[PDB]
Amino acid sequence: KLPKPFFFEEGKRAVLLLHGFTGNSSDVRQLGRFLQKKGYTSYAPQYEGHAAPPDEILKSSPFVWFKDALDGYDYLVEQGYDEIVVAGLSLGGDFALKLSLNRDVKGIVTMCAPMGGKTEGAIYEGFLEYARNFKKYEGKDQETIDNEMDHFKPTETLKELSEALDTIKEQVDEVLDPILVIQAENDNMIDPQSANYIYDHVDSDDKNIKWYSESGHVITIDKEKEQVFEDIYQFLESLDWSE
Ligand SMILES: [Ca+2]
Ligand SMILES: [Ca+2]
Ligand SMILES: [Ca+2]
Ligand SMILES: [Ca+2]
């Protein structure tokens, strides 16, 4: 079956977990379980059209996906959690930055968040591979997959994704809340220098950047995730929680 949002309720300190483009909640579930073991509540929404046939992404929009992130914050508040850190992977990291400008958070974690809307190359081919692997998961023959991929038109989606990323890059200088920037040194999906840009251009008074030398882009499921989780926990423990 396909992943669904998850909601692990423990103490009153809460973390909103935002996944990446073409990702879903399974990319942050292990982080959610780690946070739960450390006593933090977490909620991981899913963007419209994700965890679903890839055509549903083509019918959706980054503008909807950011409202899905905002809806996740508002859900935590409706469920009784007022103090919230937003932690985002890849596109979700950009959304975490932008969400902090739209909602009160105690802190921000960005994890391999791109700065800038270059979609040519790795992100384009990553989207196509995502669509091909889903069609295989649908049990489709190789001929139907090939035929269907010749009619898969990702251009408009990638253009909106590009414009959303560019807009957020120009909002980085408005970010004020405490921040942990996490980045894989050998990221083959985005430019790892994006992390230096975020770290240097946010206006936060409390910031930290951490580099990981043996992980790929999806750092929350790769081989150093235990250290990433520990570093996130140390950040969370440093923040201005009321309890
Ligand atoms: Ca409830
Ligand atoms: Ca600006
Ligand atoms: Ca300053
Ligand atoms: Ca700090």
What does DSSP say about strands 207-212 and 179-184: parallel, antiparallel, or unpaired?
parallel
Q: What are phi and psi of 112, to 5 degrees?
A: 55, 45
Ligand positioned closest to the Cα atom of 206: 4
Tell me the domains of the chain and their CATH numbers: 6-117+165-237 (3.40.50.1820)
3-class state of residue 43 by DSSP? strand
Pairing state of beta strands 107-111 and 179-184?
parallel
Reading the block at residue 70, the tokens are 């905002």
Which amino acid makes up residue 224?
A: E
Residue 182 β-bridge partners: 111, 210
- Do the strands 6-8 and 41-44 form a parallel or antiparallel pair, or are they unpaired? antiparallel
Q: What are residue 17's DSSP bridge partners? A: 87
Ligand 4 center to 206 CA (angstroms): 5
Nearest-10 crossing angle of helices 225-237, 29-37: 50
The alpha-helical segments, DSSP class H, found in the chain are: 29-37, 55-58, 62-78, 91-100, 122-137, 142-150, 155-171, 193-201, 225-237
Q: Which tokens sit at 125?
A: 């081919």
Backbone angles phi, psi at 225, to 5 degrees: -60, -30
- Mapped onto helix, strand or coil, the DSSP state of residue 180 is strand
Ligand 4 center to residue 202 CA distance, Å?
14
Residue 155: count of CB within 10 angstroms of its CB:
10
What's the CA gap between 101 and 145, in Å, rounded? 41
Q: Are 98 and 171 in contact (CB under 8 A)?
A: yes
- CA–centroid distance, 70 to ligand 2, in Å, is 21
How many whole angstroms separate alpha carbon 81 and alpha carbon 242?
12
* Active site amino acids: 90, 187, 217
* First CA to last CA distance, the chain: 38
Instruction: Specify the resolution in Å.
Output: 1.8
Cα–Cα dist 114/192, whole Å = 8
Helix axes 155-171, 62-78, angle to 10 degrees: 60
Q: Please report where in the chains the tokens 């992130």 appear, as a residue.
A: 69
Buried b (16+ CB within 10 A) or exposed e, 114-151: bbbbebeeebeebbeebbbebbeeeeeeeeebeebeee
